[PDB]
Design a protein around this nucleic acid. Structure first.
Ligand code: MG
Ligand code: MG
Ligand code: MG
Ligand code: MG
Ligand code: ZN
Ligand code: ZN
Lengths: 351, 550, 550, 351
DNA sequence: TGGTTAACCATCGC
DNA sequence: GCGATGGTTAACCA
DNA sequence: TGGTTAACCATCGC
DNA sequence: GCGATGGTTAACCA
DNA sequence: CACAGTGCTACAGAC
DNA sequence: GTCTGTAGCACTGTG
DNA sequence: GTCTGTAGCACTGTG
DNA sequence: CACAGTGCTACAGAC
């Protein structure tokens, strides 16, 4: 495993610490950007290509029938794999709007039509939500489940602004973990029912969810109530039956304690967890190969790539999987005159 | 000796650093004293009265989503950012007054003057306590090139956005059925001492996340404030006020990103109306104001949702340039200053174009263009006494806009019909110049308001006729606004240039001196004392101590 | 009330604009007065007793080719450019005091303290009036970035040159046969309050034409001044002074420009000695000081005439860097400030180099260099509390070279025998820092002066051995001087830092505050006021009114 | 008779209002760069070449025998034409030094060897001056005369700093015309004897001299004492005779009044006089063809090249002949950020 | 062909 | 001087 | 070949 | 941030 | 080892 | 027991 | 007859 | 039609 230093060339100003990289049908797409969409990209979504150490972003046109979503910073992303009816979609909810807000509306992003030369039209359809609807929240997680054999989307984690009644103009950006209720989201129709957990006494945030057949493993994430990061690992197992879903959750109390982790799929269900943070002054250097066995998740430590001094001593860092075992990370840089590109980029690869 | 408050006014009005004032005080005390000035501490406790979070007050009904505590002073503008390494960063340094408290300390500052009005108006000071209305101009401007200090951190941007407000007028209404009588009408809204700094940041205004993240709570305060009536004990009697907000004295770049437009040089030029670029150059003078905040909102909602499934450009044409979501209401209007400067830069272009002859040579090289400008600035240096500025300040703009200045350009221009053309042009422009500059056009310049529309028709037909080579498919933003929408907004608002950004931008000059002269100075507390000393600079209660009439 | 002069110094020493002073005055008079302060006109009248061209004096013999009129105030520095269109332009604006008159004001202003020295020395004030000697530090510095004013003209550059002087000491020698006794020894030469502005220009300093044109007369009256003795009635008794002139506190670009040397990064890296770069890299520490003005002139004659008929490079290697003709004689010395700064920028480079191993990889990509600076500054701000800087300021340079910051950058460098390499390096450097930078090394820090040479030997071969990959064929100018010529000078002077560029380049801050707030402001009349008000700022007689025994 | 605008490419920073273009052996050489020579040019002399609207400057190395002269601003230039055994010289005296001073050392410049790539090695020999030496002065002129058949130089005009009595710190940069005495300069040996005669009541300055066959014609100068520009025209007639020279001078009833004029030698002895100024504000526009007949000088007014607005409305302007009936002029340019080309250049051509 | 992707220029406002 | 729009032109991957 | 040749570089100080 | 030195490399006139 | 501030809280020396 | 005055704090701007 | 106070001047800095 | 200065000379209104 090794790292390749990247040059941002042009378009380096459109990445901000929260953002997304969606891997679908070959090329991966940058989602979310600094500020509102400019006219260079009316959509806001960028196709990204990496060639010979060069990181390139390009505009993505939208199909006529599509909506246009705002550049949400910390949305919950779930890859909805190719199957009936329509392959293959990246599910996004709900992120946080550049004009500062939380979009409570869930976006459904699909590939529509190619060609010709490196050109893909994407269609964005927000799915209206009947409920029981979930609150506006950000930095949480969402992931896909398949049970007997009906498919749904499990939603959990996150933060929100202080509830409308207790929110001040003095305390606003005060932000609390949301209550520990999962949402089972039927992707058709928009009914997503709330569900309470006997085993969850606290709201979790920036946690990293992984999923395989009718099962989701929530790898540890920051708690703002107690200001600590649980080493415990959450397992939940859902069974979808007409007319009511039954969710059961259990704890496997040893695992990684991490926050803001980059999950890059390498093998079939086995991701490597690159990973964000140990403590709030400490960032995780040690990389964790995570396989998913029907018996249970297991994580082998992989020998971490050699860290060049810069990424070793940085205060904060962020990124996303390019896919295919390869991921992209970014280190904020400073000197004046301003860099101008606020982030240096690294590519990192397994095997 | 001297009264403490009077002395404190002597201090903040003469721009005296507390260190320098302690130097002076110590000296006059030790040498022939019998001290006159009051020592620093009595000054510090004397100014407790003036600063916000002093006078007790209450809104009715109680404000939505606001703190009821009235004694709160300077607050860190973060407003509770949880400063997780994981979340969005804490990079900003900000200090602001909670809006309503600032407002009461600024208005309870005018208590003497509103009593003055009530006495002078021969109204009973005891009668009609609750019929008050108060018109206030809020303003916001970004100011670049702010040196970062070494500090403990956080690492923080070199741009600083400054946000303030001025109280323009207070007028009674009740009984009712009337004009309402004007108790107080500010004499010089274009003065920096009329402008009270509300908020202070280090943020770039092109960085939308952070800016909306700071100014969000403020805007909330506004949306609450529009409803409830204020209640203050004033002049001895407890009285009830109302509040009208005019968002004005924004530059256009700021309006557009705050009103959520596509900006600023796009093919959708106007803030107020929907006309395109070429569409506007085709017919200039005839336009009607349409787009407002509520409208911009519903337009965003029909963009983001896009119900009729149009592609990028047709959808962009349906909403006329609404892509972003506006988070803030701004009363539609033209800045006096930036519009002046804009028109002056366009005229700079035209002069340049008439130095050589550019309608004869449709596409000249860059070389003789630079040549042309050098000609123009040599000439403008000789006559009109003008340095060749880099970015054009409004002062330049005022100096070059004259018949007198246009004459200097008339000298170089080869032919007579052109030489006469731009002269006639400038005359036309100066006849229409005071309507968006002068404080209250209805009276101050009645005929130039009366004859505006005809005059702009004249101007535009001069463009379309003799200047068409430039203006064929294009016209500038501000030049469009000033050749279209002036009569409308004057006869609606009643004034323009009275609402000018001038008061606010001037404030920026004060900021710098205060940061350099009256700061702490370190990144932890700087905005603290900048904002404080600045708020103490604007207070009328000190200022009329400085009058000491005659 | 209170005395006029005391009040005048309540103003000048507190940075009060005369308009502002009048504001306060009017207020305190009108409110409970019984006026305290004196009105502006008696202040203006009072400060005529300080400013040069006041006290009558005489020289013997008469100063060669200088005017004998002693009442002359501010002169336009032009010295009467004939301003024919056809000749060299009149572009420059300048205001200067005639040198000697300035001096006699800045001295008779020290009359009280010089008599104080006499009575304190238990010398008789009536005896020995002839044997006085005065050592004065003249200084010059360029200051870029000055805004033009729109003005009447003439077109004038955006750069300024500000030339000043400080009186360092006065000592009595006669009877004779002695050390000479120090009557007055300045306590803080590094203060802006000790530096009196003598001359003010709007000129680029790399523009040799105009600089030599305006600064010419100054140097001439210098060449006259060092010979004749001054005669001043002081303390009631007419006394006779001698003058000693130390050119010091120049930047090196300025130095090289003024002595006609190569600038500044050429193959001849020394102002005080003849060694090239390679020669200096081989043997670092052993060099004897050679260069001086007179033989620099002889060198220019050797170059210009080229008597032995040699090829260009052979001639330039013979005369060793002398092409231009020297205008002005300066002492052979090292500026403390720019040396701290320059050694700090060198060290910035070394740390930057020791992040990624740069001796393992003979050359890097520019990209990973940028990477190295990014990590360096990010960490530096993290621990040492230092923002990244565009230029190297002295303050940064002081917070930089410490054990603290080196142990801050010792976290990054992965090799553990390199760590104590640059750590021990910094320890050595710190041990040799105060010898140049202290006010009086012989006294203040005797053992560090005592052990300097050995210490610099250690430093030098630490470079030559461990760091050689960088320093093989090259080294910095300042880093060369400081590893060679410090011990030579401090036993030729008694100090280095006492003579530094701090007093002068602290005077720029005052130039900008004064021009900005205490000037006219018109391009014509402004320099007059900057210069006058500044000279009034530096005066001791006005300064001692500001404690009056605390 | 037309103008073309030139672009100065790199290095326009080395031209200043006083300067000199020397036309010898084909190519012409710029002289007197701004300030002291930077080591990019240790000599201080630039070969100038103009191709396709482009003005170019090139360093000129000096031969081993040469003295390296300072970049003098307004020296008296006289082309000493090729003959036994000299060829071929440009005589320069004295100009005024960048460190502001006046030289009073007469430099004799000549060509030495070439090319091989058409480099030109030049040699500068200051000639020591026996007898009464012409005082340090600048902006004057010097010209070559040939009589029966001995060849010599004639020196006249110019200003100087105040004589070392009136000399002052307050009056310094103030100058005054030098006394009206010509100097007859024998170019071998360095003997130059001063001469005077009543018809010169004042020193002219910035005048232009023309030289043909032992006669020199001085076009109107600038007089400082009476501050005016004489329409009178000076004609001096020198007979070189062993062992004493005889100079007789006279006036022309009417003629041209111009200061700081450029002279380009179109024909044999006939130059188009481009010309600097008719007045202390108004600058000379019309161009004057000046032929030299044995009978007497005559001036035909030539139709002036159509001026672009800029060169017509400039306050000051300057230049020198490239030769070949072609000359180079420059207009100071203002705008900020500084261009940073302090002068726009124009080429102007006859026929 | 096609659209990248740059690249440049001129536009417009700060 | 800085950032974003918009159109023409031009480089480049299929 | 030869000397630009404009360039680009890293060097040094302001 | 700008300006000048020095050497390596690379474009170009003959 | 620049220096004179830069405004404020802390805690002493003074009637 | 109140009033007054300097020291502590980190950091400035001129390079 | 002296002392005091505002107006004239061109132009500033914030954009 | 910005405004509050910016220091100085000029000349008036005041004991
Ligand atoms: Mg702005
Ligand atoms: Mg300097
Ligand atoms: Mg300098
Ligand atoms: Mg602005
Ligand atoms: Zn419009
Ligand atoms: Zn040396």
């Amino acid at each position: 495993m090794s790292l390749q230093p990247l040059t941002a060339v042009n378009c380096g100003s459109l990445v901000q610490p929260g953002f997304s990289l969606l891997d679908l049908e070959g090329d991966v797409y940058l989602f979310g950007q600094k500020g509102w969409p400019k006219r260079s990209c009316p959509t806001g979504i960028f196709g990204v290509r990496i060639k010979k150490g060069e990181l390139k972003l390009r505009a993505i046109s939208f199909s006529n029938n599509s909506s246009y979503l705002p550049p949400l910073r910390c949305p919950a992303i779930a890859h909805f794999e190719a199957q009936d009816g329509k392959p293959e979609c990246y599910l996004i909810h709900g992120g946080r709007t550049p004009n500062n807000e939380l979009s409570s509306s869930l976006y459904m992003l699909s590939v529509d039509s190619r060609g010709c030369n490196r050109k893909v039209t994407l269609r964005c359809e927000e799915k209206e939500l009947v409920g029981d609807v979930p609150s506006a929240r950000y930095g949480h997680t969402l992931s896909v489940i398949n049970s007997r054999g009906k498919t749904a989307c499990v939603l959990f984690g996150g933060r929100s602004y202080m509830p409308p009644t207790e929110r001040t103009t003095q305390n606003w950006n005060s932000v609390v973990d949301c209550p520990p209720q999962v949402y089972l989201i039927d992707l058709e129709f928009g009914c997503c029912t709330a569900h309470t957990l006997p085993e969850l006494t606290d709201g979790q945030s920036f946690h990293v969810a992984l999923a395989r057949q009718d099962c989701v493993y929530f790898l540890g994430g920051h708690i703002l109530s107690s200001d600590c990061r649980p080493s415990r690992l959450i397992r939940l197992h859902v069974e979808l039956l007409l007319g009511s879903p039954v969710l059961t959750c259990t704890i496997l109390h040893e695992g990684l304690t991490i926050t803001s982790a980059i999950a890059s799929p390498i093998g079939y269900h086995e991701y490597i967890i690159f990973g964000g943070y140990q403590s709030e002054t400490q960032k995780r250097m040690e990389c964790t190969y995570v396989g998913l066995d029907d018996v249970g998740v297991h994580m082998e430590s992989r020998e971490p790539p050699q860290w060049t001094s810069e990424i070793s001593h940085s205060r904060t860092w962020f990124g996303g999987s390019l896919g295919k075992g390869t991921a992209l990370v970014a280190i904020p840089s400073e000197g004046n005159p301003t860099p101008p590109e606020a982030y240096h980029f690294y590519q990192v690869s397994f095997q | 000796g001297l009264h403490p408050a009077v002395c404190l006014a002597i201090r903040v009005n003469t721009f005296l650093s507390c260190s320098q004032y302690h130097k002076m005080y110590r000296t006059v005390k030790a040498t022939s004293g019998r001290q006159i000035f009051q020592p620093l501490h009595t000054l510090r406790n004397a100014e407790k009265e003036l600063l916000p979070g002093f006078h007790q007050f209450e809104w009715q009904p109680a404000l939505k989503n606001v703190s009821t505590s009235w004694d709160v002073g300077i607050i860190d503008g973060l407003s509770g950012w949880t400063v997780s390494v994981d979340d969005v960063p804490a990079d900003t340094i900000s200090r602001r007054f909670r809006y309503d408290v600032a407002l009461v300390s600024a208005l309870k500052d005018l208590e003497e003057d509103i009593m003055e009005g009530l006495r002078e108006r021969a109204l009973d000071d005891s009668m009609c306590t609750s019929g008050f209305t108060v018109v206030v101009k809020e303003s916001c401007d970004g100011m670049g090139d702010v040196s970062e200090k070494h500090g403990s951190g956080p690492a923080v941007p070199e741009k600083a956005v400054r946000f303030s407000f001025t109280i323009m007028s207070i007028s009674i209404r009740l009984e009712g059925e009337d004009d309402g009588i004007t108790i107080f009408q500010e004499q010089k809204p274009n003065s920096e001492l009329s402008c009270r700094p509300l908020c202070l940041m280090f943020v770039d205004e092109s960085d939308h996340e952070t800016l909306t993240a700071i100014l969000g709570p403020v805007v909330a305060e506004r949306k609450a404030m529009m409803e409830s009536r204020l209640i203050i004990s004033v002049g001895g009697l407890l009285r009830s006020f109302r509040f009208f907000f005019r968002g004005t004295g924004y530059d256009e770049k700021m309006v557009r990103e705050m009103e959520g437009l596509e900006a600023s040089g796009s093919t959708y030029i106007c803030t107020l109306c929907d006309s395109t670029r070429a569409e506007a150059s085709q017919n200039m003078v005839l336009h009607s104001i349409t787009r407002s905040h509520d409208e911009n909102l519903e337009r965003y909602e029909i963009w983001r949702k896009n119900p009729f499934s149009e592609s990028a450009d047709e959808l962009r044409d349906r909403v006329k340039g609404v892509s972003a979501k506006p988070f803030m209401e701004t009363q539609p209007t033209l800045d006096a200053l930036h519009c002046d400067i804009g028109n002056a830069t366009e005229f700079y272009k035209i002069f340049q174009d008439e130095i050589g002859e550019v309608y004869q040579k449709p596409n000249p090289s860059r070389e003789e263009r630079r040549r042309w400008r050098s000609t123009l600035d040599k000439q403008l240096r000789k006559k009109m006494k003008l340095k060749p500025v880099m970015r054009m300040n409004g002062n330049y703009a005022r100096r070059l806009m004259t018949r007198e200045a246009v004459e200097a350009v008339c000298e170089l221009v080869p032919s007579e019909e052109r030489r006469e053309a731009l002269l006639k042009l400038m005359d036309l422009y100066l006849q229409m110049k005071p309507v968006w500059r002068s404080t209250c056009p209805s009276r101050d310049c009645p005929d130039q308001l009366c004859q505006y529309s005809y005059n702009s028709q004249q101007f535009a037909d001069l463009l379309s006729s003799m200047f068409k080579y430039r203006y064929d498919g294009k016209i500038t933003n501000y030049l469009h606004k000033t050749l279209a929408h002036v009569p409308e907004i004057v006869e609606r608002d009643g004034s323009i240039g009275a609402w000018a950004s001038e008061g606010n931008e001037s404030g920026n000059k004060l900021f710098r001196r205060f940061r350099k002269m009256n700061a702490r100075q370190s990144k932890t507390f700087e905005l603290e004392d900048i904002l404080k000393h600045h708020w103490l600079y604007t207070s009328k209660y000190l200022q009329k101590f400085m009058e000491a009439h005659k």
